[PDB]
Amino acid sequence: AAVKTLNPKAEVARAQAALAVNISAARGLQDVLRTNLGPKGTMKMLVSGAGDIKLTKDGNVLLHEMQIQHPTASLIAKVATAQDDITGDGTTSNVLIIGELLKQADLYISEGLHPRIITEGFEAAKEKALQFLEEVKVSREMDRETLIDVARTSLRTKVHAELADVLTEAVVDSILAIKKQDEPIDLFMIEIMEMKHKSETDTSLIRGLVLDHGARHPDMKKRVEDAYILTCNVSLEYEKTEVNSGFFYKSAEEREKLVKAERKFIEDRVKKIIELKRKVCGDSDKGFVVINQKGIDPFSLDALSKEGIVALRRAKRRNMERLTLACGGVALNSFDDLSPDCLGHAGLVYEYTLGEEKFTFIEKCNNPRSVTLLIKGPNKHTLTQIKDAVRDGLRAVKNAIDDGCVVPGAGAVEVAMAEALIKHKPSVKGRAQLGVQAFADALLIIPKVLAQNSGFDLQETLVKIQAEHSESGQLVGVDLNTGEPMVAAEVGVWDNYCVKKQLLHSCTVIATNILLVDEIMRAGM
Amino acid sequence: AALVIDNGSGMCKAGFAGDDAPRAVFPSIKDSYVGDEAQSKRGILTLKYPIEHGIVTNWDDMEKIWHHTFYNELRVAPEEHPVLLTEAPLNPKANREKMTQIMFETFNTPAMYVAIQAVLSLYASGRTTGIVMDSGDGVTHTVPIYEGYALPHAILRLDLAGRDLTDYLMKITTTAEREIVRDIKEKLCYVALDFEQEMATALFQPSFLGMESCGIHETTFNSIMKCDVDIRKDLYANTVLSGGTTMYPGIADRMQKEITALAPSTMKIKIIAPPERKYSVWIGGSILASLSTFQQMWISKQEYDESGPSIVHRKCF
Amino acid sequence: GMPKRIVNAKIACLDFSLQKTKMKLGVQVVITDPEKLDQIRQRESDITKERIQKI
Amino acid sequence: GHRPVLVLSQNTKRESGRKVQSGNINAAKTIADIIRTCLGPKSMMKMLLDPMGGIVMTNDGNAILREIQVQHPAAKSMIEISRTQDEEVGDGTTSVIILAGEMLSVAEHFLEQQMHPTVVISAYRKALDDMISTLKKISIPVDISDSDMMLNIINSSITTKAISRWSSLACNIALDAVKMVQFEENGRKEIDIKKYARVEKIPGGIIEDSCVLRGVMINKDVTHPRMRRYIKNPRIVLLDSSLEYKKGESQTDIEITREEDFTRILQMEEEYIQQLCEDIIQLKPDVVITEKGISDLAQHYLMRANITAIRRVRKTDNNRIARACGARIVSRPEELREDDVGTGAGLLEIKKIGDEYFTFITDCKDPKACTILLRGASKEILSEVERNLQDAMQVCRNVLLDPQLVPGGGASEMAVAHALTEKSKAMTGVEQWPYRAVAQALEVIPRTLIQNCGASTIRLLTSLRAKHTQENCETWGVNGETGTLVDMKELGIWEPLAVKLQTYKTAVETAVLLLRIDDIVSGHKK
Amino acid sequence: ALHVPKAPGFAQMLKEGAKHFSGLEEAVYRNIQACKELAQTTRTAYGPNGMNKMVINHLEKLFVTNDAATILRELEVQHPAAKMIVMASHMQEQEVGDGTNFVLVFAGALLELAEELLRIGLSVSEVIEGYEIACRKAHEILPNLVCCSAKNLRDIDEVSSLLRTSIMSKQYGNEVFLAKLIAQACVSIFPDSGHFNVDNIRVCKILGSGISSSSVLHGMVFKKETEGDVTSVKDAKIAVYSCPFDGMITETKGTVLIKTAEELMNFSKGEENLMDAQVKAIADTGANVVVTGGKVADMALHYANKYNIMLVRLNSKWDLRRLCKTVGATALPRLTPPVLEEMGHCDSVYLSEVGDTQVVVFKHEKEDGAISTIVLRGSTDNLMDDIERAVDDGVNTFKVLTRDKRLVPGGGATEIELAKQITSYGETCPGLEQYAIKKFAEAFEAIPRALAENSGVKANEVISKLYAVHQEGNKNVGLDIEAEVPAVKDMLEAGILDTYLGKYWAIKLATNAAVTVLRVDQIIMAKPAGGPKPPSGK
Numbered sequence A: 001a002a003v004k005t006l007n008p009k010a011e012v013a014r015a016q017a018a019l020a021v022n023i024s025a026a027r028g029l030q031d032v033l034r035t036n037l038g039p040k041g042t043m044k045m046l047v048s049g050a051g052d053i054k055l056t057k058d059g060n061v062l063l064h065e066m067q068i069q070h071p072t073a074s075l076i077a078k079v080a081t082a083q084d085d086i087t088g089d090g091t092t093s094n095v096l097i098i099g100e101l102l103k104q105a106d107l108y109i110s111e112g113l114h115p116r117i118i119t120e121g122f123e124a125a126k127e128k129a130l131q132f133l134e135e136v137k138v139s140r141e142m143d144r145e146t147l148i149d150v151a152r153t154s155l156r157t158k159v160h161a162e163l164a165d166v167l168t169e170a171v172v173d174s175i176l177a178i179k180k181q182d183e184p185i186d187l188f189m190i191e192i193m194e195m196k197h198k199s200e201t202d203t204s205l206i207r208g209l210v211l212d213h214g215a216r217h218p219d220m221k222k223r224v225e226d227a228y229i230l231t232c233n234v235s236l237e238y239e240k241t242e243v244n245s246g247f248f249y250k251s252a253e254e255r256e257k258l259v260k261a262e263r264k265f266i267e268d269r270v271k272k273i274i275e276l277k278r279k280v281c282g283d284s285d286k287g288f289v290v291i292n293q294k295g296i297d298p299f300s301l302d303a304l305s306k307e308g309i310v311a312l313r314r315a316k317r318r319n320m321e322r323l324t325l326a327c328g329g330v331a332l333n334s335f336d337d338l339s340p341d342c343l344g345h346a347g348l349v350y351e352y353t354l355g356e357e358k359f360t361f362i363e364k365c366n367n368p369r370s371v372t373l374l375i376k377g378p379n380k381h382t383l384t385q386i387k388d389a390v391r392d393g394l395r396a397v398k399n400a401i402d403d404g405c406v407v408p409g410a411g412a413v414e415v416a417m418a419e420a421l422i423k424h425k426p427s428v429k430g431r432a433q434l435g436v437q438a439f440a441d442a443l444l445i446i447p448k449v450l451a452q453n454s455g456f457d458l459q460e461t462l463v464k465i466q467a468e469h470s471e472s473g474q475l476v477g478v479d480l481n482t483g484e485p486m487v488a489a490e491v492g493v494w495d496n497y498c499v500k501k502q503l504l505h506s507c508t509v510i511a512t513n514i515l516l517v518d519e520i521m522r523a524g525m
Numbered sequence B: 001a002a003l004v005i006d007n008g009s010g011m012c013k014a015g016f017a018g019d020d021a022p023r024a025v026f027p028s029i030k031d032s033y034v035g036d037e038a039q040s041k042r043g044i045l046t047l048k049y050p051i052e053h054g055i056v057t058n059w060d061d062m063e064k065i066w067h068h069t070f071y072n073e074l075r076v077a078p079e080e081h082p083v084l085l086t087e088a089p090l091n092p093k094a095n096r097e098k099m100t101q102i103m104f105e106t107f108n109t110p111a112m113y114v115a116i117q118a119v120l121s122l123y124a125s126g127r128t129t130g131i132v133m134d135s136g137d138g139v140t141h142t143v144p145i146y147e148g149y150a151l152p153h154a155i156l157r158l159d160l161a162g163r164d165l166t167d168y169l170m171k172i173t174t175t176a177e178r179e180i181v182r183d184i185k186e187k188l189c190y191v192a193l194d195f196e197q198e199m200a201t202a203l204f205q206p207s208f209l210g211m212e213s214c215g216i217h218e219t220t221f222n223s224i225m226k227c228d229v230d231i232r233k234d235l236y237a238n239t240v241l242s243g244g245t246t247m248y249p250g251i252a253d254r255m256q257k258e259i260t261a262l263a264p265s266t267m268k269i270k271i272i273a274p275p276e277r278k279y280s281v282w283i284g285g286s287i288l289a290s291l292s293t294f295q296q297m298w299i300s301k302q303e304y305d306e307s308g309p310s311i312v313h314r315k316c317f
Numbered sequence C: 001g002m003p004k005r006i007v008n009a010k011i012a013c014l015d016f017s018l019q020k021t022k023m024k025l026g027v028q029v030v031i032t033d034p035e036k037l038d039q040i041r042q043r044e045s046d047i048t049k050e051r052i053q054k055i
Numbered sequence D: 001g002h003r004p005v006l007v008l009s010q011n012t013k014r015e016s017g018r019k020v021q022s023g024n025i026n027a028a029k030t031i032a033d034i035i036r037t038c039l040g041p042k043s044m045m046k047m048l049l050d051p052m053g054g055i056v057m058t059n060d061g062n063a064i065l066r067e068i069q070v071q072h073p074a075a076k077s078m079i080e081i082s083r084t085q086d087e088e089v090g091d092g093t094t095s096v097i098i099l100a101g102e103m104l105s106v107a108e109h110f111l112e113q114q115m116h117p118t119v120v121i122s123a124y125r126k127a128l129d130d131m132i133s134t135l136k137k138i139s140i141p142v143d144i145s146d147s148d149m150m151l152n153i154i155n156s157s158i159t160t161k162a163i164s165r166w167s168s169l170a171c172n173i174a175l176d177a178v179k180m181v182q183f184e185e186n187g188r189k190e191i192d193i194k195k196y197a198r199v200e201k202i203p204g205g206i207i208e209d210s211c212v213l214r215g216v217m218i219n220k221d222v223t224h225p226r227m228r229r230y231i232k233n234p235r236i237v238l239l240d241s242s243l244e245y246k247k248g249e250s251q252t253d254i255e256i257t258r259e260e261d262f263t264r265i266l267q268m269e270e271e272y273i274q275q276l277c278e279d280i281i282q283l284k285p286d287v288v289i290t291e292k293g294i295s296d297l298a299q300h301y302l303m304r305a306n307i308t309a310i311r312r313v314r315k316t317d318n319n320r321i322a323r324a325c326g327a328r329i330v331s332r333p334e335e336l337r338e339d340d341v342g343t344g345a346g347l348l349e350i351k352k353i354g355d356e357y358f359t360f361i362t363d364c365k366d367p368k369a370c371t372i373l374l375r376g377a378s379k380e381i382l383s384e385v386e387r388n389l390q391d392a393m394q395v396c397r398n399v400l401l402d403p404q405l406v407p408g409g410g411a412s413e414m415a416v417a418h419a420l421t422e423k424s425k426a427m428t429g430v431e432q433w434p435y436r437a438v439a440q441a442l443e444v445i446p447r448t449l450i451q452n453c454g455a456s457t458i459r460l461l462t463s464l465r466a467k468h469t470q471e472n473c474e475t476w477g478v479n480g481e482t483g484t485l486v487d488m489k490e491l492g493i494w495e496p497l498a499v500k501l502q503t504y505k506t507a508v509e510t511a512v513l514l515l516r517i518d519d520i521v522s523g524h525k526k
Numbered sequence E: 001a002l003h004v005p006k007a008p009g010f011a012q013m014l015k016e017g018a019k020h021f022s023g024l025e026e027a028v029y030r031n032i033q034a035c036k037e038l039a040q041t042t043r044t045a046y047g048p049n050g051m052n053k054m055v056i057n058h059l060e061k062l063f064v065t066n067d068a069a070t071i072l073r074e075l076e077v078q079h080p081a082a083k084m085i086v087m088a089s090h091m092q093e094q095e096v097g098d099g100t101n102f103v104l105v106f107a108g109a110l111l112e113l114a115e116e117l118l119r120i121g122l123s124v125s126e127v128i129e130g131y132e133i134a135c136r137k138a139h140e141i142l143p144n145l146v147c148c149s150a151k152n153l154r155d156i157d158e159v160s161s162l163l164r165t166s167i168m169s170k171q172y173g174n175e176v177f178l179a180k181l182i183a184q185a186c187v188s189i190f191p192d193s194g195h196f197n198v199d200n201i202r203v204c205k206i207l208g209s210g211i212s213s214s215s216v217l218h219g220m221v222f223k224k225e226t227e228g229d230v231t232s233v234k235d236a237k238i239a240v241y242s243c244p245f246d247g248m249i250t251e252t253k254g255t256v257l258i259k260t261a262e263e264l265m266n267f268s269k270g271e272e273n274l275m276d277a278q279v280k281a282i283a284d285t286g287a288n289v290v291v292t293g294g295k296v297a298d299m300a301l302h303y304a305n306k307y308n309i310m311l312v313r314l315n316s317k318w319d320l321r322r323l324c325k326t327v328g329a330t331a332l333p334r335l336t337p338p339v340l341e342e343m344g345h346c347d348s349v350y351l352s353e354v355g356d357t358q359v360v361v362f363k364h365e366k367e368d369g370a371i372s373t374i375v376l377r378g379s380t381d382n383l384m385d386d387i388e389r390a391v392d393d394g395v396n397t398f399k400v401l402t403r404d405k406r407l408v409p410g411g412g413a414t415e416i417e418l419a420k421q422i423t424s425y426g427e428t429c430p431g432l433e434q435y436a437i438k439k440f441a442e443a444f445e446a447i448p449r450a451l452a453e454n455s456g457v458k459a460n461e462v463i464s465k466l467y468a469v470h471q472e473g474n475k476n477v478g479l480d481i482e483a484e485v486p487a488v489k490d491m492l493e494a495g496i497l498d499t500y501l502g503k504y505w506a507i508k509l510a511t512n513a514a515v516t517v518l519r520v521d522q523i524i525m526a527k528p529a530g531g532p533k534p535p536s537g538k
Ligand SMILES: Nc1ncnc2c1ncn2[C@@H]1O[C@H](COP(=O)(O)OP(=O)(O)O)[C@@H](O)[C@H]1O
Pocket: A036, A037, A038, A039, A058, A059, A089, A090, A091, A092, A093, A094, A153, A154, A156, A157, A158, A408, A409, A410, A411, A446, A450, A478, A479, A480, A493, A494, A495
């Protein structure tokens, strides 16, 4: 060929062969991910080269963990990664719709049709589908019940049903706490701490904070009832001078004086803390907890323990904000002019030892604008799975709140959009109508696979559902327990409008760009 | 890919994972065209190399260097490639926090990892367990490594490097003439199994130089004896030497003999010190960055944003 | 931030660098009264400033 | 033994003669055939695989040729001229390759027929000069104040690219960006769309929400969460200096013998940071942006003044923030003046896009810098959108500098080829044949357009070559979407005269270069 | 036509050394087979008649034990499903301390029976439904099977009788001696507060005198020697310092700047006079014993000898913390004399030679303290490690009894009653769940089956007898180890009892592990790494 005469070690796939490559890879991905879709899907186990185990049903995780070296698979994995980074859910469905668009386009390109016409039909169908989506979207006041149904629709796909019923309340309560009226939800204000000791259904929402470390001085209390929290970012350990000072003495007595003096700088900050503590709690009734983003040497730990202060050091840069929003103080980088108004309050602070590590709970805050999800479970992979599930659920509830609209689920919107595309087809000029048909049969992959996963006949279920939607018009989807049509909005099966829109847009775009590929080429050597 | 910047108290020796040689040896590495393709480099050419004795003195310099070892001698972008930097053994935590703040905040690197130069040297030799004797220009280090990680508790640090070595030879003053003594140090300086039979036809012993701490063989022996008694066999039998200092005299067998003497009469000690690829640390870094366990060890950008200097310090205080 | 066109160009050709002043090899700063350190650091830059002002 | 007594080093291979000529010409026309199908509006994408595991899905001639590797020096030269075209005008990077390939192809004829390469070269130079004359003759001016005319000019440049589906959107972006980057100081006009028009690709979202900001955007958050993240009239200060306490350049070694000296020294460090922060607060800013670090004590002092700081920004981002908010970067807060403070920004926001915090300095008035925020399905799609937008912006710039237009659809190629054929009838020497062959070699652009449209080259080219023999038909060309001849005044495909002039010059000069070449040599070390 | 090509799609795009298993045949049955192999590997160690195993790990270290969790840790289990069952067993070891072998046996049995049910035609989903509902029934049932409770954990005869069962499976021959020792140790600890810390039970393994020479010591033992000339003290007034026993030095850098011959002449004398003052202040507080966590200086040691102070050097920081808890002292970061509260006290501190080993003993006379030590004598390090594991089992049982004082009958009695009751529950449940419920019930039979098989008798005769006697109404009946023939007896009247919490958590974790293994349908193994192991686990 052309490239192989100049770079002999070049790999090239031309026109039809290139199409053959790309579509084949897409269909391969679909075959892997088809089983991930829905609550009746199957969990895959993924073993790293080190031997670490992952139990997952998540499309993005599955992609990045499968062992694949294909360029089309790389493209589709990146599209799914963007879907996950922006919406948190929709990756499996993204891959499925991409694969099905490519397959339905191969249906007509094998018949000698040019991919350009299919892509024109794709663009027309995208427009009409986005219109029908905005029309059918359900604008709803996001109440705890609506958000609970949303989070259920996500967690029931990602985890077991009882654990999903737990994570639902956990996630919805978590978001409804860190949420400020008409102010985008900062999910950073939900810490996510995992503990590896108890059952997975013990995963809870602490209306406060859980630090993965505790006090390093033993004489420090392990439980504090009415606590003043001092969130600081001030070094309380020995800091050497920037200018390489060095000490010079002529006598052991002078050496002793210099040893006592070299710590005066940090002794002064410890003294400031101790004076604040004494001035704010003159008795032993209340407690005082210092949480430092920086270090605290053993001398400072002793000095603070002697006065009855619980000092934790080298906390996380995000815990500064989480503590100032949960407890309610001010985070400090200096103790120059500190006042009791710089302190937060916690109605309980205590310590929990788990094997070799320590955790510190800060609870009974007044109205914490930051909370934590304590992911308890008996196994590392259980914890990872629950983390992925709660990420999905948090993104789902956040998106349902941000986008006050919510879309019916169980493939209902896909069925209805397919019918609408099929009714719209004649209005398209030329043979791009065939691309529209392909788009419809691509949209129809969501209910089909759901049936495929619940153990039903794709064709029979899909005809039943489309018939029910044409006779009634009720947005209906798959009942995974009977295989019959069901009204998703009535049974509480909700999807995110943002997710469906992102699916349509990104899937159409990547499928168009793949269909217009006519040469794959590796010639960089 | 993954950029593997090997500082190694040498030059930048930067490149990509998979390359058998670095592509960006900046310190001591066109014109008449149009543009700023020489002036921008002419600025760096006369800039002092920050790392001295295996420790970063001037950070602004180092940052400017890295920036010029990314945009000019690699013509790439760090915002999409993970970086593997290297640090000297027993490197202060503060330097780690500084370089991690530079990479994640300035260069906005998606993920990075800091590896010990001796561990990467051992990697380039193909092994994952053993005790590395790294003696360069300013420092001497014994790093016991088991399962591929430098045990942070048995790192014995003594100081008898090229400088300290050529010192006594100078004794036997002016820059040029002490560099004649150092030229002889650079050339053949065969290690003596026994100085008796070596001077007859004419570091191991502190008294020789004038120190009063320990020999390098004593150092290795005690670094092996501060580890697990089961891995003791592997430490004793996989001692890997590195450093141009230790290469110049080619010391293998004198060490081997006196280490055997110190050790029990059980473990057989074999020292592999013939490589001299002159890029061992770089190749070890490339191997690591090529592996998937490097993705496992990634300090990610999100991790950095969430933890700061704590993520750089890996908690466990 | 510098302009990129000048009309009545008065040109100064210098064969030395305009950088923060560093004491040469045989000169050391040794503080025994911290109150002087600031002023010393300040000269390290003010020296160069004065040269540029003269130009 | 008797070691080889050679004159040249072993491995030194020397070719010579018509084999070298034919080899160079075949390598060139192979480079051409690689991207021949990537020309016009009905082109198809190519997915190239980088050595770094990356992927590049594109239609751009220079992208493709830059991603492939060759060893033949003629192919090297063709890739280099594609790079030249991309750097100079930023469009036509594949038209140039095709034209150069065809010129070399037609010169192969005359070389096989005992003509000397210098004769062919002199003819090529005559033909190039006359092309220049004809282009400058048929060009028309443009009123750059007509935003719609400019949007049509930019559409005629992106119609051949993937963003064509959001063509109008992309057109506005490019136009807006360029109109903001136009800057004049001391009588020097500057459209520097490489340092001051920045493209930030954030995967996710939808492309239709991508926009050009009246300001800049960086990937940054406040240094301390007590700092504001939303400021509606920010006074902004830019710094090249660290707000930390760093060492001196000399050997500033200290010597302590008294007790109070250590504490006094550490408090002196704190006082230095205090004095820097006070020198800054005296200007009463709302936002402070540094290229270097900011110590936590400095953060405390700035926050006390209710100031928001962003710690470690790039010098390029700092320069764009300067141009956008109207500030002047300083390096010594003691030397800070009101003229160096940045007024002009209308809003500073720090918002969460996905799981990242992005700093916008938007709502600026008269910002001489901009950030094009691209949103889309994936890094690959957005890299392609960025390259297409580079094409659009480079075209807008070429227009604003030289407002002359020429017709597209191959109309210009046929008009100039006809003019050259008509002038050739006065030529009586032996160069008339290569000259007319270059005229027939310009025809390849419409040929390629027709081929990529899927139409009949013979019939259409015949009708078009005939149309261009009439009087007022120098604007007639072909559609790359239907395969019919049209008037460009009726279609609207008009390219910048500068683009096509540079195209023709690069093509003809590359042909001259490869024709002069003979006698390849190889082997010798550097 | 001589090669089958990889099918288009995932089969071709898969990497070189990666593996993909899918479906009941390639994945589910292979996982169940692996877990069955695991259960078989550890089955013969279950119970008092369980035999020891000699596992040699990759470092050629030898473990001789019948402790399931130890064997699993020291085995290199590489199959992922078996890895998951081992993860469950280790969670059992962490939560309770005993019952890991129950977890393995029960999980392996549940998975074998799940394979059977899948073969007869049930779906993994229905098997999981039945297993979970049956686990819920087992947890509903177990509280009713509780027969005894501790009723006192400050006693030593009751506590010994209670720990005997946990320390019988391990170290069957000698279980009264060890239970006495562990009861003595556990009750010296366990203050008036309901909190009991297992790290406060220290075990010192010294070699050479048989296990019957083991002893309890209300105090601490350190295989150290004394730094100075004093070796015994009868009214210890211990002063504990985290700092070395040397002059404090600067954190920045220290240089002795001499400018006059007089300063040079006086520096060293000033140093020693300073050291003399420091140690004399310490001695004058009454301290006769000093314990430093850092190094000792020659001059400071000189003056400690002069003023008759016993010096002890503890390299570890945990050893120092535990000594502080023992003696009631406070580790001072300065060499300042201790205040009356910062000082610790001991009825004796002395250097002794237990066997070949020299030891420093901080011994209280009172039958209490914050820390107690068990000095294990023995002719073999491996034997002493096995006895230490038995001690750990007994101590974790004591803690479980501090948490929950309820006890169920052992020797398979609880398992047989559970099997019977869950079978009676499954016989009532209609639908496809009854098969899985009855298999979950029959899985309990694996425990008395393993006990019988290991005792050396016919498991079928034993299980038939147990079913017959439990039908007559006796829920406390289990099998008799003291019988050459299949026999059974009252576990309660014999005193063979297990912990309600032990069984609760073992059933919960085993059921969760089996159900997790079953939920897997596709496995996508990656090519094995040469990576320098997990970074976090070091
Ligand atoms: N209870 C349910 N019944 C029917 N369909 C459901 C139910 N829950 C979720 N779905 C549908 O299953 C599909 C896939 O779910 P999920 O796997 O979470 O999405 P993704 O495939 O993006 O990960 C969604 O389109 C959702 O509407």
